[PDB]
């Protein structure tokens, strides 16, 4: 979905602040070309959209859409790509119309879309074109939400935008109830090794596979293992075939990051209840079970890349070497004889990755230091200890080490003799603070993780995995996330319609061969043509018993949970099901920040940070307004003077703190004896009276 995007902003086009709210609104022509659901939430709504599914780009640059031309009320199969111009002149039929086995509109009239854009209603004679299928308006990322016609546009948009942010887990399990766009959007994503020519497997290994085509020449595919993505995720890849299997052109051979058996699987299926549990899931918070931590059900991999360079300076050339200025000998027990660390070393926060050293220059040491070097018989040196150390809060093994050198023909930028990069891997478990989300735009951070033993467990002894809150469902108009919760249970238990004498009225239509499904069976529900409110209720009265004949979920779809903490059962049946949730990439390890005292900008003495630098938080304006509204003058002045600019104040307070004395009362800052000079530079004589 990064491809197929269309941004009205950028060079040669309009801007983001000089374009009124008219190019943002959805036009009745976007139907079939640009999806109205999928779009960013920031200050870009409507400016950046995404192509539809069936659409196609004209030779000039106009977006087309396929229709089926109906002649005399006889829906034919002559598909014809219409542009946006020659569509209004004609009359377009509706996707789901009662055609009867030939292409005849059973009923006498039909819905339409006339030129202007209105939604009229006409007789079954003027209709000349008809959509090829529903979901034409829907983009790719949106066409994967089950029960989309039950969610509001806001929540559907959030769900469509919260799928391109998921992370690839370690197991990558497929979703129990999705739509048809799963299997047909992974083989096209370009991360599923697709058999090129129909052959026969000859040899497979975690590293590569070989196929023996029917005509002599074989072909060896090389799957990429543990390659770092652009955002730090893992690009793992693994074969899904044996040494004898027969394969045909197009078939899947190797899974991808988020794929499973060659189809999109962005998350895991978890048993979820819809009760509020003693205030731990309050206003979008979510509680989990320890099972999701013990059994590595949401464990993910992350690979970060640190990099340093050794150039030539005015005094000489920086050298990456194991030798170092005054330093211990326990901070070198993992560096190879030539500096850079050894693969497999379990590094942590603060450790050393690359041994760098730069010429000091020349100075003159005060007595106290000369009388100290003489004592410790360590004559001074002319080098600075500027190495490459791991940033704050980062650990995990060292995977790969890359090294380029000017002396070895490894071209690099101007004035760079060497350049080294180190990759550090880390397996992150689920932890309170990590954001989660379903398909239906519902989201929330993880607030509490109860032990596996105190969690509402079904009458059998199976503990619920996640516990979503109720007050978030009604007022957000995303009851979709409830329907899939019901169906999710059916497709997990497996049903068998009791129609052994006659198909019941409710399920006499939908498919054949769908009146029974083995437990843990996969299903699908296209966006605007899927299950029906009157069909689940029919599929919920047949939920074959787990092991001993005992239906756990009554007709309405609610179980009888026991309170794992108090022991006794809850007084009312609770809704439970299987929901497909995904772990988003907004982990706390990325957000958490802090700074006691770091580096400061040189021109402006305000704090400043970077990669391995804290950075300092920004005390804005409205915060000063609030401080003043409290009447707290000392706190405001402290946040304004001895924490931002006053160089003689920061050190004078740090010394006091460390020595345990009283913090000196904030006087008039030194940023006031500079305004007077900047004024007097204009021949203005300002005097303090």
């Amino acid at each position: 979905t990064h491809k197929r995007r269309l941004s009205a902003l950028g060079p040669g086009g309009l801007s983001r602040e000089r374009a009124g709210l008219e190019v943002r609104d959805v036009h009745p022509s976007h139907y079939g070309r640009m999806c109205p659901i999928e779009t960013p939430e920031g200050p870009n709504i409507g400016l950046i959209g995404s192509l539809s599914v069936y659409a196609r780009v004209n030779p000039f640059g106009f977006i087309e859409t396929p229709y089926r031309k109906v002649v005399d009320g006889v829906v034919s199969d002559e598909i014809v790509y219409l542009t946006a111009d020659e569509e209004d002149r004609h009359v377009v039929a509706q996707a789901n119309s009662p055609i009867d086995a030939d292409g005849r509109f059973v009923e006498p009239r039909v819905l339409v879309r006339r030129k202007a854009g209105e939604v009229e209603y006409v007789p079954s004679s003027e209709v000349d074109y008809m959509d090829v299928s529903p979901r034409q308006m829907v983009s790719v990322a949106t066409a994967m939400i089950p029960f989309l016609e039950h969610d509001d546009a806001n929540r559907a948009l959030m769900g469509a935008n919260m799928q391109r942010q998921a992370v690839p887990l370690v197991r990558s399990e497929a979703p129990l109830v999705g739509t048809g766009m799963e299997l047909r959007a992974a083989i096209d994503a370009g991360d599923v090794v697709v058999a090129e020519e129909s052959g026969v497997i000859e040899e497979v290994s975690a590293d590569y596979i070989t196929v023996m085509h029917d005509n002599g020449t074989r072909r060896t595919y090389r799957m990429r293992k543990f390659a770092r993505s652009n955002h730090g995720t893992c690009a793992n890849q693994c074969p899904i075939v044996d040494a004898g299997d027969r394969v045909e052109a197009g078939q899947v051979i190797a899974d991808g990051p988020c794929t499973d058996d060659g189809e999109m699987a962005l998350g895991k299926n978890l048993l979820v209840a819809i009760m509020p549990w003693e205030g731990h899931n309050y206003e979008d918070a979510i509680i989990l079970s320890n099972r999701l931590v013990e059994e590595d059900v949401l464990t993910s991999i992350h690979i970060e890349e640190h990099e340093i360079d050794a150039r030539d300076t005015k005094l000489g050339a920086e050298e990456i070497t194991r030798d170092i200025p005054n330093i211990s000998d326990e901070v070198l027990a993992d560096l190879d004889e030539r500096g850079i660390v050894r693969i497999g070393a379990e590094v942590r926060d603060g450790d050393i990755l690359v041994g760098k050293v730069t010429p000091k220059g020349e100075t003159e040491l005060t007595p106290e230091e000369r009388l100290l070097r003489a004592i410790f018989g360590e004559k001074a040196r002319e080098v600075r200890d500027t190495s490459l150390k791991v940033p704050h809060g980062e650990s995990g093994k060292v995977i790969g080490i890359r090294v380029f050198s000017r002396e070895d023909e490894d071209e690099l930028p101007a004035g760079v003799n060497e350049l080294v990069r180190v990759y550090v891997a880390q397996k992150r478990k689920i932890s309170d603070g990590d954001k989660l989300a379903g398909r239906h735009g519902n989201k929330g951070v993880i607030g509490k993780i109860l032990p596996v033993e105190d969690m509402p467990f079904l009458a059998d002894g199976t503990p619920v995995d996640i516990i979503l809150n109720t007050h978030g469902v009604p007022r957000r108009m995303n009851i979709g996330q409830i329907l899939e919760t019901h169906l999710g249970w059916c497709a997990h238990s497996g049903w068998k319609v009791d129609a052994a004498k006659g198909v019941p009225d409710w399920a006499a239509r939908l498919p054949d061969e769908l009146l029974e499904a083995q437990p843990n069976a996969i299903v699908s529900t296209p966006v605007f043509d899927g299950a029906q409110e009157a069909e689940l209720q029919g599929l919920l009265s047949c939920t074959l018993p787990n092991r001993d004949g005992d239906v756990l979920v009554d007709a309405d779809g609610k179980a009888m949970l026991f309170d794992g903490r108090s022991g006794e059962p809850f007084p009312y049946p609770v809704t439970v099901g299987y929901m497909y949730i995904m772990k988003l990439h907004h982990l706390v390890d990325d957000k958490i920040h802090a700074r006691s005292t770091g580096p400061y900008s040189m021109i402006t003495q305000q704090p400043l940070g970077g990669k391995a630098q804290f950075g300092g938080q920004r005390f804005g304006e409205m915060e000063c307004w609030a401080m003043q509204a409290y009447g707290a003058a000392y706190t405001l002045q402290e946040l304004l003077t001895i924490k931002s600019d006053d160089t003689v104040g920061r050190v004078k307070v740090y010394e006091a703190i460390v020595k345990g004395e009283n913090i000196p009362e904030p006087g008039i800052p030194e940023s006031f004896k500079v305004l007077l000079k900047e004024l007097q530079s204009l021949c203005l004589n300002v005097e303090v009276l």
Binding site: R4, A174, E248, L510, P511, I522, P526
Partner: peptide, 27 residues
């Protein structure tokens, strides 16, 4: 459907799909 070794995902749909999805990356 129309893929050599894809899994069998039962569908709840009712209509047909005269045209099959294009080469999504064609654009």
């Amino acid at each position: 459907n129309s893929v050599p070794g894809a899994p069998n995902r039962v569908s709840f749909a009712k209509l047909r799909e005269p045209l099959e999805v294009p080469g999504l990356l064609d654009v």
